[PDB]
Design a protein around this nucleic acid. Sequence first.
RNA 1: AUUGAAAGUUUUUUUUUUUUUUUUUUUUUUUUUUUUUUUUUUUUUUUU
Length: 55
Amino acid sequence: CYIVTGHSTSSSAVYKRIFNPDPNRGSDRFDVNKFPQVCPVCDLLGNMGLASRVS
RNA sequence: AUUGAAAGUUUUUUUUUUUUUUUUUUUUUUUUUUUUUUUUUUUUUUUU
């Protein structure tokens, strides 16, 4: 799950071609009792309010 | 209807004066407002 999306303010077609874009995919929500399950990457690295098993 | 009677025991006099329920007697002696809690996590100084 992508962590930060925001809005598209600049275009870099080289990035869009080298790496496959996926605008459909959303983002992880939180680590509170509401929606505690997260994407594996968010669980590994970190998320808002969930720390990083890694540094 | 008496031997036969008609007389207030009355007038007058303050139970009054002297004397602070008073002196001494600290509602104090002791008791730490402490005690467990990371201002922490998420974010590539960056493109036509």
